């Protein structure tokens, strides 16, 4: 109630970033984020875990606005520059999303869907797509496994999309 | 356009004089940028006047 | 009285702005649906010179230069046109749907 | 049949006047070329005998153009104003 | 059942109730998506209960 054009322009600005970018690097959004998050009281105390709750669920809906570029980056080139802005993602995802956008130790269908598409858009846009895939998939065994937990639970529903 | 030009040409009298624009210059008045978005953030999808 | 016309939703033009982007970046030569889907509708509507048809295409107009001005700016021209030979595509699209169209309407001047 | 048929024209002509502005050319083509349909026409349009609100509106939009567009014959802009102004149991 | 309760739990009932469930599974009821938007346009975000 304010907000739904400013936030269209914000994706004019980052689409355009995006291309100025495809002309590595990591994201500024999850350096936003990091600061906010650090910058607000470090207590357990239920006012800050409620304030903290309504700052990641305001996050998660900026990116589920903005393009699924922004979470896995776009066009993983080669071996050696592998796992860039996924990494960045996997700690948000770790510190932040399992503590209160998660319910049954699992992600939500919005972001994890989000994530997924990204994805496949990267690695069909790169070459090896199947073993790149396979490479991303098996390091989210040791760096987010939150991730592989929450797609076991919307599967049926990313199963069409994927396919 | 808009409502009333007696209030129409109030507003522009007080926009095209003299000591308004040279007030304008030495200012925290100049409306930063998070100002104006924080204004057009305050007004709403449900009046529009535009 | 009909008394103007009521808006309803600017958000769901912003969810198709999502999926847009998102089918975009996975074509980065053919062609976009919706040029096919704008060539349908005004197809569908009468060919007269009658007020109420005039006035009726000019809206139709009018609205899908709404959704192409929200949209991106690459389903016009497509992205990175690659050579010579595979040149001009979906920028044929776009000049057909100014000449047959927004030169009657959306022109002026 | 023309005071219906007027009556979805009007409409059209008053949504695309809302996203453009300055008065539909179809319009301004069918007062000049048919004025008989004009008339019929231009009867609806100040058929609105209603109580005008106080912050006007896309009809009023409308009304305005068109008599600073030096139509609307000053007699019907006249009525418009009068009219708008007003035991078994 | 006909109770006059509250309309919340009257609705959550008539969900929950397996006779309502049967007559969605005949699919000229299922609110294809089509459906969906022709009821989701009309709603204003003027005046909205979300």
Same mark, same amino acid.
């Given at each position: ?163 | ?15 095209? &004089?003299? /000591?308004?624009?040279?007030? *304008?210059?030495? $200012?925290?008045? &100049?409306? /930063?940028?998070?100002?104006? *978005?924080?204004? $057009? ?8 006047? *535009? | ?109 | ?89």
């Amino acid at each position: 109630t304010g907000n739904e054009d400013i936030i269209s322009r914000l994706q004019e600005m980052v689409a355009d970033l995006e291309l100025q970018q495809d002309l590595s690097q990591e994201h500024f959004l999850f350096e936003i984020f990091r600061r906010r998050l650090q910058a607000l009281t470090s207590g357990w105390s239920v006012a800050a875990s409620l304030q903290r709750q309504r700052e990641l669920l305001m996050y998660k809906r900026i990116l589920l606005r903005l393009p699924s570029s922004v979470l896995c980056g776009s066009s993983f080139q080669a071996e050696q520059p592998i796992t860039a802005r996924c990494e960045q993602f996997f700690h948000l995802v770790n510190s932040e999303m399992r503590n209160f956008c998660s319910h049954g130790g699992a992600l939500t269908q919005d972001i994890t869907a989000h994530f997924f598409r990204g994805l496949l858009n990267a690695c069909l846009r790169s070459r090896d797509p199947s073993l790149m895939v396979d490479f991303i998939l098996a390091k989210c065994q040791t760096k987010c496994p939150l991730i592989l937990t929450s797609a076991l639970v919307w599967w049926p529903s990313l199963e069409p999309v994927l396919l | 356009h808009l409502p009333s030009a007696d209030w129409q040409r109030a507003a522009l009298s007080l926009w095209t &004089h003299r /000591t308004f624009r040279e007030v *304008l210059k030495e $200012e925290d008045v &100049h409306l /930063t940028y998070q100002d104006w *978005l924080h204004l $057009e953030l305050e007004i709403q999808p449900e009046a529009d006047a *535009l | 009285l009909v008394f103007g016309g009521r808006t309803g939703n600017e958000d769901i033009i912003s969810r198709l702005q999502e999926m847009v982007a998102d089918l975009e970046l996975q074509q980065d030569s053919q062609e976009h649906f919706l040029f096919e889907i704008f060539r349908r509708r005004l197809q569908a509507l009468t060919s007269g010179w009658s007020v109420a048809a005039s006035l009726q295409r000019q809206r139709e107009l009018l609205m899908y230069k709404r959704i192409l001005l929200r949209l991106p700016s690459s389903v016009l021209c497509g992205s990175s046109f690659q050579a010579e030979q595979p040149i001009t595509a979906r920028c044929e699209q776009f000049f057909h749907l100014v000449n047959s169209e927004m030169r009657n309407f959306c022109s002026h001047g | 049949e023309p005071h219906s048929q007027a009556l979805q024209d009007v409409e059209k002509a008053i949504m695309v006047f809302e996203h453009t502005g300055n008065i539909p050319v179809t319009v301004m083509e069918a007062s000049i070329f048919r004025r008989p349909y004009y008339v019929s026409h231009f009867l609806p349009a100040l058929l609105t005998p209603r109580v005008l609100p106080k912050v006007p509106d896309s009809r009023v939009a409308f009304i305005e153009s068109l008599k600073r567009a030096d139509k609307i014959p000053p007699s019907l802009y006249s009525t418009y104003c009068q009219a708008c102004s007003a035991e078994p149991l």
